[PDB]
Amino acid sequence: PSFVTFRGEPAEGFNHLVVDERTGHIYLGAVNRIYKLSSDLKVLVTHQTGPDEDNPKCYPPRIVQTCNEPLASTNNVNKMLLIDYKENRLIACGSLYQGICKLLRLEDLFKLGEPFHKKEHYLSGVNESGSVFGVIVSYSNFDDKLFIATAVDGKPEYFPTISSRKLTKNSEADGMFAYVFHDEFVASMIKIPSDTFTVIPDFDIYYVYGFSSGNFVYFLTLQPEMVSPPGSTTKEQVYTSKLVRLCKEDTAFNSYVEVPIGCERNGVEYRLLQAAYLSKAGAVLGRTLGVRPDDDLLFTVFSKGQKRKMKSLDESALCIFILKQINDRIKDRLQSCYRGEGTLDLAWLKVKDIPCSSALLTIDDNFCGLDMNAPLGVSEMVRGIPVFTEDRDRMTSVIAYVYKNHSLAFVGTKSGKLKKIRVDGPKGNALQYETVQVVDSGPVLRDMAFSKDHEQLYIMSERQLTRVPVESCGQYRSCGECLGSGDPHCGWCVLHNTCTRKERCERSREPRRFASEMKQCVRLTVHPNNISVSQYNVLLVLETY
């Protein structure tokens, strides 16, 4: 069988992918292109975002004002892509405009609007794809907004790295991408200080993954050497991967928190986030994990060491974080600051260390942040629970989902292969199967999403999107073989005499209809085991259980 795929319609490039929960239509961000595809990966519609005459150096791009520097036709990279269901559209933020964002209609990809005029309308000069992320959160009218983080490239005055912005109903409206609350003193945005730039020239925050949880917004980020590694003057840059969080409700931006994150395997350090995916455990993992049904979990992928964010190392490890545990670390940290102990310790933001002020407070998970002991960092790096480690071929991406309570994890590789891992710390075992639906020579991207029905998993490559089905038990002919393979998806559908998943077996719910363990098979015996050649039409009795 062959896997259904979409070749780079522009054979030329590819960057981001997302699935519409209701339709199953797949939208694909790319350089100079944004595509709308069917569940089957047929081309529904192609939008030309591309090649625009422009220059990165110029501030307000050519349209607003004249630029002395020479222009050249350059490629517009889709930095981000986010589905706005309520608005019935797609926010497809590009670059090469000083980062102007575009709005495409959901069904046809008709350009509803693309605000260029104001400064807020420009997100970032940064040309790199995937270095940006964010979430769209919506409520009924008179309650709403967009949270987005992006790299600056040393543009600190022009753009904020993290911001809370407005998304008006009308795409034509001027108001778009305006800050939720702007005050002369404080605005719902966080800028990088000029002082920090002078000290370390290159400092920049790259945002890999982002998700909304409960009533907060988290970001997995990469930053530069600031007290790590120690160094008197500039020289080499190494990165520290950290977690960021904000209250959805905090216009002030007081809630900002930032903990370094990683995990270690037998004395080997894995500091750099490649990708992450928030998900549910399902009954199996949750129980042994000790969680409530609602509680979330965060699968992640990290490379070894602090070196070369641009081109990381092959050594990579899939770790895990329970949100309850991270929430605890944050609460623990806050309850501490409220003690008045130590400093805030956030190097890039505050050069001069300000002390934490003690105060009487009931420290809860609900705590949104206060005026004093304002944005703060974290001392203790939060360690994660390791799961699978690949030395030979680096993991690029990850996804996970709940199936019949068993938790299946998906992991992209540098090779263009997907691993189907049942996580069984809470259960007991490891990796079930590996597949090369994708692209035999070269890698898979972080945007890897399961379909709404959860039948398939769209796997994106630089070149192509591939619809990889989540099991291929049919290959197994007999109950003995089916249960023999062990890849957890497979069971013996007794009456059908075929090997497939629980969902696939009709009436599997009923007793002895479906066999999970070899014992359940099938066992057969014949009373006259031996019959002579000379004999004919002998009566035989068969015992089957």
């Binding site: 607003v64 350009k111 005029h117 034509e172």
Partner: protein
């Protein structure tokens, strides 16, 4: 996109006379109705001034369905023959598409 009624058509509405001094950098705001949002494969708006001496092509921004503005630029005509020279202006988008100008509003270069 459909236009059933004549009132709804894409056209430029008039404002107080557009006065333009020669050799001065000035923006020219315009008002209009039912300006289309350019669709895929379609470029943005430009202001074209038909001056016999020199025809100027200045790109513009369509803020909404009813307002436009040519970017900061200066205009001139050679001759110093006459103080007030009215000039026909054509608003175009996607290169060739000229928006209708019923009033046939002009720019006065003085």
């Amino acid at each position: 996109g459909r236009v059933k009624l004549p009132e709804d058509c894409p056209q430029l509405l008039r404002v107080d006379k557009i006065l333009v001094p020669v050799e001065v950098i000035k923006p020219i705001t315009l008002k209009a109705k039912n300006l289309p949002q350019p669709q895929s494969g379609q470029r943005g708006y430009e202001c074209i001034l038909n001056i016999q001496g020199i025809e100027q092509r200045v790109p513009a921004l369509r803020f909404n369905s009813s307002s436009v503005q040519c970017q900061n630029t200066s205009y001139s005509y050679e001759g110093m023959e006459i103080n007030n020279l009215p000039v026909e202006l054509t608003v175009v988008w996607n290169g060739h598409f000229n928006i209708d100008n019923p009033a046939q509003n002009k720019v006065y270069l003085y």
